[PDB]
Amino acid sequence: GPEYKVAILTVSDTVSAGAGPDRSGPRAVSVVDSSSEKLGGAKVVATAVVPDEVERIKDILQKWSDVDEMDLILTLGGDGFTPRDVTPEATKKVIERETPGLLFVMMQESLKITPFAMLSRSAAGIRGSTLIINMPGNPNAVAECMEALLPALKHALKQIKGD
Amino acid sequence: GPEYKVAILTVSDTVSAGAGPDRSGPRAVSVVDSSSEKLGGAKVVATAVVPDEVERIKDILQKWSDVDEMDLILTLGGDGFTPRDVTPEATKKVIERETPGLLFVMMQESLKITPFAMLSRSAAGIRGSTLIINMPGNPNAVAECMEALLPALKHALKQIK
Amino acid sequence: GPEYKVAILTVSDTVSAGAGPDRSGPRAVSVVDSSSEKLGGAKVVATAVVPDEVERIKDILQKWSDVDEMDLILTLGGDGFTPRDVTPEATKKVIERETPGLLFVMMQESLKITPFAMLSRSAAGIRGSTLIINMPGNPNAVAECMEALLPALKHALKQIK
Numbered sequence: 322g323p324e325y326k327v328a329i330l331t332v333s334d335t336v337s338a339g340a341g342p343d344r345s346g347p348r349a350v351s352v353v354d355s356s357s358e359k360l361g362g363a364k365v366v367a368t369a370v371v372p373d374e375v376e377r378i379k380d381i382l383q384k385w386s387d388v389d390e391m392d393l394i395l396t397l398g399g400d401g402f403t404p405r406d407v408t409p410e411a412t413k414k415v416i417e418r419e420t421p422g423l424l425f426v427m428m429q430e431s432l433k434i435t436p437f438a439m440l441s442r443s444a445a446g447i448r449g450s451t452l453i454i455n456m457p458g459n460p461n462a463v464a465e466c467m468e469a470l471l472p473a474l475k476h477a478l479k480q481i482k483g484d
Numbered sequence: 485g486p487e488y489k490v491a492i493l494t495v496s497d498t499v500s501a502g503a504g505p506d507r508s509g510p511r512a513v514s515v516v517d518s519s520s521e522k523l524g525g526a527k528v529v530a531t532a533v534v535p536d537e538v539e540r541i542k543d544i545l546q547k548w549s550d551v552d553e554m555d556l557i558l559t560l561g562g563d564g565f566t567p568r569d570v571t572p573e574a575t576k577k578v579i580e581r582e583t584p585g586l587l588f589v590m591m592q593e594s595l596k597i598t599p600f601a602m603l604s605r606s607a608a609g610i611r612g613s614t615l616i617i618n619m620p621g622n623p624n625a626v627a628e629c630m631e632a633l634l635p636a637l638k639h640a641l642k643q644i645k
Numbered sequence: 646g647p648e649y650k651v652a653i654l655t656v657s658d659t660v661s662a663g664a665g666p667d668r669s670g671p672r673a674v675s676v677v678d679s680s681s682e683k684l685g686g687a688k689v690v691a692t693a694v695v696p697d698e699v700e701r702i703k704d705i706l707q708k709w710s711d712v713d714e715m716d717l718i719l720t721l722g723g724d725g726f727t728p729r730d731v732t733p734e735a736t737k738k739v740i741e742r743e744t745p746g747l748l749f750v751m752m753q754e755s756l757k758i759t760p761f762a763m764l765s766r767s768a769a770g771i772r773g774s775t776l777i778i779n780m781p782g783n784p785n786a787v788a789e790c791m792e793a794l795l796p797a798l799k800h801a802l803k804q805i806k
Binding site for chain 3: 409432438
C-alpha cells in the first residue's frame, strides 16, 4: 500500500524493561503520517523497542534493512552523552554510505532552538536501499528533526531507489 | 610552471561510457583558472574521467597523489544518494587526514541556495601533500563550492607544502 | 576538591623542544578558571606539552583518561593542515564515542569570526568518562571555542558522569 515503508526504532533501557512508557514513538509515527504527502506517500509499518545495547540495535537495523526492506528507519534515543547511549556507534557499524548533510541540517536547525542540541551525537546513512537516521529521544525532537529534513527527504528516498 | 598543480576527476558511468559529453569537467577547469590569482597561482594541469566504481576512483586519486604529486584534486559527481554514487567512500579509503572544515563550509553555503544541498555526501581530506575535495556533478555546483572555499583555499595549500 | 578535573595538552614541536614558549596554554587555563561556575565547578589540575608525534599524543590522552581519570581534556594545536599536525588523528584513535555537535558548534561560531576557521580539523569525543576536545593553537581560539561550548559544556560533563 505505502509507496515508502518507514519503521521507527525506540532505543531505551527504561522503555524496554517495561518500567516506563514510550512518549516519543507515538509522536514520530504521528509526524510521519502528517507528513505523508510531502514525503511522496509514506507510512510507518513497524515500530520496535530495544534497550541501550549495541548488539540489539545492530540486529534490528540489519533485519529491517536486509530482510524486511524498509525504506526509512528513524531511531529515537541513545544518541546523547550518557555512558549507555550507543545508538550512533551501532548505526555506524551497519551503514555503508554516510549522509552527513542530513546530520548537518538536523544540527543546524536544532541549535536555533537550544544550544543543548550540540549534545546530540546523531549518525545517519544508507544500508542497501535503506535510509537510516538517528534522532533524539524527546517527543518534540522528532518533529523538529523531521521539519528540517522534509524539504529534501522525498527526493532522497526517490534517489536511493532509481531516479 | 604553476605554483599549485590542480587536477579534476569527473565521475560518471555515462561520461566514461562515451554516451554523453562531459558537461562539468571543462566548467570546473575554467573556474579554477579564473580563480588562479586568488588561489596563490593554481592551475588545472590534468583531468580524467572514471565511471562510478570505487576501485577506479581510488586508483586515480592514489596515482595523482602518490606519483604525479598533484597539490589539489577536485572530484565531480558520484556524491549523492543514487546506488552507484560511491565517490566519498572511495575518497575516505585514500585520505589520511580529514578536513571537515571544508565540508562544513560547502554544506553551509550551498544550503543557503537550496535544501537539496543536504543530499551531497561529499568527503574531503589530505593524502600525502595532496588536498582532495569531493564536489557535486552540477556545472553550477563547482563554482558555488569554489566561491565558498576561496577565502581560505590559498592558505590551505600553502600550509600543506 | 574540584567537581570536574580539567587537563590541558599543548601540542607543538616548537614548545616541546624548548625553542619557544606556550602562549595558548595559559589562556586556556585562564578561560576554564574564569568559567568555573558556568562549567559546574571546574578547575585545570594538570597541563602538559608534547610534540606533534601521534604516539606521544595518544599516550597522554590514554593516561589522562584511563589512569588520572580527568573529566575534560582540551588539546591545543596540531589540528591544522601542516604536515606535522596530527592531533585529530591521535584523538580519533583514542575516543570511543564521537561528539560531532561540539565540533559543529566550534566551527559554526569560529567561521563568523574568520573563513580561516575552516582550516581547523578538530576532533572530539568520549573515552571512558573523559570528554576530549581538540582546539587550535591560537590563544584567542580557546576563548572563542570555549565561549561557543559554554552553554552546554556543564550538562555534557554531568551526563558522562
